[PDB]
């Protein structure tokens, strides 16, 4: 029975948060400067709170709402809020799957769309934006999203992404209807295919030119940017979002386990496997990313050398990258009148700046892996395999999330006595798909950025904080420890008690305080926006109406607890 529960938890935890979100989160916050807090935030926040969730799931042996209502009525709201967050997650998570579907369907063509730029119009060169950016970046930002230059500018619903999202939701609904316990052979298959695909892409990814640059960028802990509180916040929230803490379905999963089971081994194993999968996927992604950065640096050096050679009438191969500055000085010393004209035009390029600004954003995984595919031998087969592994991961994670969404609805006899579960699930999927059309607009990627960074980011911290305070202080840690010891024969270790009672809540509170102080001091929340004319990413301030949505997404889920407490107090009085 241990294998079933462990593999169920692994299949829930291992999803797009490990393969897709972790790489771009690591790239955005400095690479190593993000990896050091992650590990630091895994020993303190991941393991103890995951173990606490699994133990509450066993000792209550009820659902999330049932458990947090049986501990105390004044607290039942934290069971409701843990559902709402899942809702918001299921509202936008599917968009990622849609994108993969798109990238799958554009994978049966000999001239792969992200391989060759379109012709300029003279039929003699390439597009300006497709040349300034990469072919993969041009495909991702224009052919896939058609991203608008700013959040204030939005068009209509792009029909192709809308159809892809509709297909993804239909697939999710079909998986919901079809199977619920036939995961026997799937757990044997769906847990090894992602690792096999990542192994293949690692085998390709570690033989590319300049892969070590990517690894060095990944593993170098720059102290200068290590002081950013946002890096710590993002590390903690990614840990919570990848382990599933706060969504309330881990409690339901542990509710079906025997009370004479070791949840100290299972929690440790699940957390370590999640961490290892994230690290491996990010290693492959950053090896390919380092190859991209090295290629960009070499291309810039070649362009500068060609510019100098075509003007100074130097030999074809005389000006190389190993003697550039000296020959530049020699040319400058030869005659300054000619050199003065083009000195603005000569561009400075270095590996470091390219590494920071080669590829960044929520499309890092897609761009990087499409580039790697375009450098394969049979690109179609590897593209199909990778975007099928990604499809399986997304579908499994969404099955877990939607089960967490739907179980409270099915368990409610008020709704279950009026409509079939097949109709309740159909209505839920329809509502989610209809609301998620806002991510398919021209400026839909910015709303996806907002939901990816605020819908299920900080609410998971407050939910887990309330849960751990509830378990430790309201219920009584001595009573909980005695109950657990009676259930499993072994008393909880002193380390787990220490991390439950004081360390994790204090660290969460400190992180919240630091984030709030940083936001107040900065006073200007900014987002990345695509610039096709410059062909890169620029920072723009959020408009007035985008802050209302940002505030409400967190506020509804977090404030659902105190409102329930106030309602219970009113009912008592």
């Amino acid at each position: 029975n241990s294998l079933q529960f462990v593999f169920a938890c692994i299949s829930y935890a291992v999803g797009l948060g490990n393969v897709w979100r972790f790489p771009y989160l690591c790239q955005m916050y400095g690479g190593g400067s993000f990896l050091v807090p992650y590990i630091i935030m895994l020993i303190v926040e991941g393991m103890p709170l995951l173990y606490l969730e699994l133990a509450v799931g066993q000792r209550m042996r009820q659902g999330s709402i049932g458990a947090w209502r049986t501990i105390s009525p004044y607290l039942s709201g934290v069971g409701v809020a843990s559902v709402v967050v899942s809702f918001f997650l299921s509202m936008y998570y599917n968009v990622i799957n849609a994108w993969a579907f798109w990238y799958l369907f554009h994978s049966f063509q000999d001239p792969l769309p992200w391989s060759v730029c379109p012709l300029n119009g003279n039929h003699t060169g390439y597009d300006e934006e497709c040349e300034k950016a990469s072919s993969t970046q041009y495909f991702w930002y224009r052919k896939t999203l058609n991203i608008s230059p700013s959040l204030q500018e939005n068009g209509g619903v792009q029909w192709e992404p809308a159809l892809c999202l509709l297909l993804a939701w239909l697939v999710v609904y079909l998986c919901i209807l079809r199977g619920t316990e036939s995961t026997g052979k799937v757990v044997y298959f769906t847990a090894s295919l992602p690792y096999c695909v990542l192994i293949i892409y690692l085998i390709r990814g570690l033989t590319l030119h300049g892969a070590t640059n990517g690894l060095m960028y990944m593993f170098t802990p720059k102290i200068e940017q290590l002081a950013n509180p946002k890096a710590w916040i993002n590390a903690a929230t990614q840990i919570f979002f990848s382990l599933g803490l706060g969504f309330g379905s881990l409690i339901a999963f542990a509710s079906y386990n025997e009370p004479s089971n070791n949840c100290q081994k299972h929690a440790i194993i699940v957390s370590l496997i999640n961490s290892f999968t994230s690290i491996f996927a990010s290693i492959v992604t950053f090896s390919i990313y380092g190859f991209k950065a090295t290629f960009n640096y070499e291309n810039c050096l070649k362009k500068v050398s060609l510019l100098l050679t075509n003007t100074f009438d130097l030999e074809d191969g005389f000006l190389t990258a190993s003697n550039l500055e000296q020959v530049k000085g020699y040319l400058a010393s030869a005659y300054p009148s000619k050199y003065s004209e083009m000195f603005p035009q000569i561009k400075n390029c270095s590996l470091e700046s390219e590494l920071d600004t080669a590829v960044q954003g929520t499309g890092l995984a897609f761009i990087v892996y499409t580039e790697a595919i375009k450098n394969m031998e049979v690109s179609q087969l590897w593209s199909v395999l990778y975007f099928f592994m990604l499809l399986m991961l997304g579908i499994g994670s969404m099955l877990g999330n939607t089960a967490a969404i739907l179980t409270p609805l099915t368990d409610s006899k008020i709704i279950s006595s009026h409509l079939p579960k097949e109709a309740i699930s159909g209505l839920v999927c329809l509502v989610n798909c209809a609301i998620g059309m806002v991510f398919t607009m021209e400026a839909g990627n910015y709303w996806f950025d907002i939901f990816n960074d605020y819908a299920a980011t900080l609410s998971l911290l407050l939910i887990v904080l309330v849960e751990t305070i509830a378990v430790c202080y309201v219920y009584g840690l001595r009573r909980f420890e005695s109950d657990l010891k009676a259930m499993t024969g072994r008393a909880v270790s002193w380390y787990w008690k220490v991390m439950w009672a004081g360390v994790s809540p204090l660290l969460i509170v400190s992180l919240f305080v630091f984030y709030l102080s940083d936001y107040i001091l900065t006073g200007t929340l900014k987002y990345q926006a695509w610039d096709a004319s410059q062909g890169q990413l620029v920072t723009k301030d959020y408009p007035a109406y985008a802050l209302a949505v940002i505030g409400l997404l967190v506020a509804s889920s977090t404030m659902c607890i105190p409102l329930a407490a106030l309602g219970t107090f009113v009912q008592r009085r």
């Binding site: 579907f101 798109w102 799958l104 369907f105 554009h106 049966f108 063509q109 001239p111 060759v116 379109p118 012709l119 003279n122 039929h123 003699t124 060169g125 159809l163 892809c164 509709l166 297909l167 239909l170 697939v171 609904y173 079909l174 209807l177 079809r178 050679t309 075509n310 009438d313 130097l314 030999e315 074809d316 191969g317 079939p420 097949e422």
Partner: protein, 166 residues
Amino acid sequence: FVGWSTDWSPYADQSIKVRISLKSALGDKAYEWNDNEMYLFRSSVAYAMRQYFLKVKNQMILFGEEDVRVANLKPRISFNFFVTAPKNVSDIIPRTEVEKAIRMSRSRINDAFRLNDNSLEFLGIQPTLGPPNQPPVSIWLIVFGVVMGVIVVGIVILIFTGIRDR
């Protein structure tokens, strides 16, 4: 402006500038650009002029390697050439006709030196890459239609079986 430059001439508009990059297109195993290579280049240019005047204007003009005058040779291998009348130097073929002749037979000149349109730049004659022919309608749309159809059929049959069982 006081003074003069010894490089401007009334016939300098008719010159065509050629820039050659041997060690970039070939890397190693690249021949050196001695006088024999210049002789072969002038012969190729004269051949192109003959082909243009035969296949367009229907005139048989006996150009030669001495009718392609070359100046300003430099170690980059970048010079200026102009084509004159077969035995009358005072007559210069206008640059438009020379450009048309080069365009007509640029592939042969490229093949004579094992260069491809990037290491042999005529600085005024730009090549055409070629239209990217499109597939019949759209492969992605067909695949998406098939997948959506099979998914919808599965959903319908599962719903019908579940309803009929209960």
